[PDB]
């Protein structure tokens, strides 16, 4: 069951590269593409993400996309820059100017067919393609605008495949431009309709974690991407290593998505660590379970106590007592049963994987579908409305052919999504 990976825009390519860097190390693949590991667990399902090449070389099934060559040139000169298939580098020259319209309708529409040629070339090599995963931000132009354009066209050509995304949400605390709420709202509209699974990665939460918890006075994007790569590794563990639970993208979707539009997940992770800062003390299982559920460990700036969990997927990594894990997992549900919907019996599922990530002897990754996620979309909607009520900064969009009505629809659909999440919070 092969997965085709796509990374779009500056953010998309910067976390996308970091992702391939991290899991390549876990699968024992060096920058050359050669395997140098000591466990056979590493190679059993390496076909999910890697293509097998001459000399038993492994090549990521990854497609790199951008409307400017800057970031992708940095990727190609980065640590694992050479592992990527050079033909899978598809880039324009004009950029998107943090403009959704440019990415979706003009600049990106010019490039999108070239990208789909590569997607198609990769897909036909697959014995049994299960689907796609996209990494991108929603606050810019390329990843947000062209990324959702790609999603729409992939769904057209592969309507029976799963679409998955890692979507970075914009935050004023970590902001490039004022129009990020516009770009994000337009994108969420697209995501609600055309993805089955979306990991909501909030730059607000990533900032707060770095500041409040990791005590980083002034966090960079590099710091923020330490958390993202750690989270991305964890939520894909069940897909990359042998196991019985949530092993493919469809079975994850069937277990996590009770209603088709409500497919926006809160990722969580424990223990939280900063770059370089060495951890010497391994956490106990009770500690991992408590932390991975705490709001301070959520990658989406939402209070889980303000909502209810529809579904939960948990993945413990390392050498530990699987009996202690099940005990602690059952304790959380039994002590805080109110925060789990009673009309989905046994909605918490747990997996365990012997291989821990690098630098930690054990870890836990959390994937929650909570109604509390509405707080994320409400926040975006408020920032959106503040500007839109005065039609501020809209000329950037009307200049590319967009009409005000399209903003109104996007606004309305996100507010509908909010109310849908609220409907089940009071069930």
């Amino acid at each position: 069951r092969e997965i085709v990976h796509i990374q779009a825009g500056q953010c998309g390519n910067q976390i996308g590269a970091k992702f391939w860097e991290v899991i390549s190390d876990e699968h024992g693949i060096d920058p050359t593409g050669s395997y140098h590991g000591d466990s056979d667990l590493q190679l059993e399902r390496i076909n999910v993400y890697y293509n097998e090449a001459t000399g038993n070389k492994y090549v990521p099934r990854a497609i790199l996309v951008d409307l400017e060559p800057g970031t992708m040139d940095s990727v190609r000169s980065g640590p694992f820059g050479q592992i990527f298939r050079p033909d899978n580098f598809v880039f324009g020259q004009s950029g998107a100017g943090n403009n959704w319209a440019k990415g979706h309708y003009t600049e990106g529409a010019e490039l999108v067919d070239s990208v789909l040629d590569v997607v198609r070339k990769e897909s036909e090599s697959c014995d049994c393609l299960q689907g796609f995963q996209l990494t991108h931000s929603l606050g810019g132009g390329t990843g947000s605008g062209m990324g959702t354009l790609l999603i729409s066209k992939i769904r057209e050509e592969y309507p029976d495949r799963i679409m998955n995304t890692f979507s970075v949400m914009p935050s004023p605390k970590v902001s490039d431009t004022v129009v990020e709420p516009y770009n994000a709202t337009l994108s969420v509209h697209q995501l609600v309709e055309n993805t089955d699974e979306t990991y909501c990665i909030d730059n607000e939460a990533l900032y707060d974690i770095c500041f409040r918890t990791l005590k980083l006075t002034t966090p960079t994007y590099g710091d923020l991407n330490h958390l993202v790569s750690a989270t991305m590794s964890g939520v894909t563990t069940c897909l990359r290593f042998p196991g019985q639970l949530n092993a493919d993208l469809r079975k994850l979707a069937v277990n996590m998505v009770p209603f088709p539009r409500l497919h926006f997940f809160m990722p969580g992770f424990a223990p939280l660590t900063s770059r370089g800062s060495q951890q010497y003390r391994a956490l106990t299982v009770p500690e991992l379970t408590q932390q991975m559920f705490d709001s301070k460990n959520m990658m989406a700036a939402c209070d889980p106590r303000h909502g209810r969990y529809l579904t939960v997927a948990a993945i413990f990594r390392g050498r530990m007592s699987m009996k202690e894990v099940d005990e602690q997992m059952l304790n959380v549900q039994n002590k805080n049963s109110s925060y789990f919907v009673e009309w989905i019996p046994n909605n918490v599922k747990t997996a365990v994987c012997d291989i821990p990530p690098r630098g930690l002897k054990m870890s836990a990754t959390f994937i929650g579908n909570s109604t509390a996620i509405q707080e994320l979309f409400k926040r975006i909607s408020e920032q959106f409305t503040a500007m839109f009520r005065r039609k501020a900064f809209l000329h950037w969009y009307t200049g590319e052919g967009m009409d005000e009505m399209e903003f109104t629809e996007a606004e309305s659909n996100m507010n509908d999504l909010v109310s849908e999440y609220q409907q089940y919070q009071d069930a």
Partner: protein, 336 residues
């Protein structure tokens, strides 16, 4: 932090229990349809016993014994006593009774009824309500109401309290925990009559039936027509030169244990995936010769206002906290 659910709102006994539990600050009440509970204070009808004990990571306990209704239904109690060898059919502390269905052992009842007639014995009986000395007066009544009743011999020579020449019945509260220990609450109550007992005319049922309901001369001799044991014992000492323990309570303890031990193998939760306890209300009757008779067993009994605090706290200590411990006794253990 233990958890529990409430599925019987009309329960005065366990309304007080849920109160006490919460007041420990170590018990949290959940919604009625929440399955992740430690304790279930269940409903009286169609309690879903089958959905209990299937929650991984949860020790579960319920305040009812599945199958105990065979003891606590009038038609069933008769059948139980008659068919059980441990209680024979010649059980000496249960009034002669028969199961009669509307249009069974109707012929058998007449082979007793007419036997009395030709033998010139007392012939007042009771339908379960109609106290009569003529059979067809009864058989016509049961067929007129609808569903099955029980016909039982009326104790025509009851013990009568003086002052008043009154009739009474004794209510004993029994708690059976998860280990099937049988605990008799040391405080019982005499639910007395206030209008003197009339041996001749049976139909005015105010002096024949001693239900706390019916009689509300109420409050004349006793506050609430409820004589507790300290007074009843003192009366027995002064008026009959004996005690409550010797003259009555030994028979009560004997009857309670015999009844519950008969059905232990059918309802015990010893090796079950869930656990049961239950509070019973045994109703006894004393004749003039100080011979105790069992009248019925109540599966969902209420308590007496004075004793609620003590009994309900008692339930928490030995039935609940015994299973779920927290961070001299008011019961008599009927040993076996």
């Amino acid at each position: 932090m233990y958890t529990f659910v409430v599925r019987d709102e009309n329960s005065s006994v366990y309304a007080e229990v849920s109160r006490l539990l919460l007041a420990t600050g170590q018990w949290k009440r959940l919604r009625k349809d929440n399955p992740r509970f430690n304790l279930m204070l269940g409903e009286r009808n169609r309690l879903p016993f089958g959905r209990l004990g299937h929650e991984p990571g949860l020790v579960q306990l319920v305040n009812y014994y599945r199958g105990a209704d065979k003891l606590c239904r009038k038609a069933s109690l008769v059948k139980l006593i008659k068919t059980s060898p441990e209680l024979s059919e010649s059980c000496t502390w249960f009034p002669e009774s028969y199961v009669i269905y509307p249009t069974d052992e109707r012929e058998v009842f007449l082979a007793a009824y007419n036997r009395r007639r030709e033998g010139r014995e007392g012939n007042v009986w009771i339908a379960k309500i109609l106290i009569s000395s003529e059979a067809s007066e009864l058989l016509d009544f049961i067929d007129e109401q609808g569903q099955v009743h029980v016909i039982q011999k009326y104790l025509e020579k009851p013990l009568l309290l003086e002052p008043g020449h009154r009739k009474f019945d004794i209510r004993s509260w029994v708690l059976v925990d998860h280990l099937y220990n049988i605990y008799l609450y040391r405080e019982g109550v005499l639910r007395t009559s206030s209008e003197p007992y009339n041996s001749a005319n049976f139909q005015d049922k105010t002096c024949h039936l001693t239900n706390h309901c019916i009689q509300k001369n109420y409050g004349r001799y006793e506050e609430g027509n409820e004589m507790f044991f300290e007074e009843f014992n003192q009366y027995l000492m002064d008026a009959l030169n004996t005690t409550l323990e010797n003259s009555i309570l030994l028979q009560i303890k004997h009857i309670i244990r015999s009844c519950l031990m008969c059905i232990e193998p059918a309802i015990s939760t010893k090796h079950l995936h869930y656990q049961s306890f239950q509070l019973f209300g045994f109703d006894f009757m004393v004749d003039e010769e100080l011979k105790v008779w069992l009248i019925e067993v109540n599966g969902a009994p209420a308590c007496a206002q004075k004793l609620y605090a003590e009994l309900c706290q008692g339930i928490v200590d030995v039935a609940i906290s015994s299973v779920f411990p927290l961070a001299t006794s008011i019961f008599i253990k009927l040993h076996h």
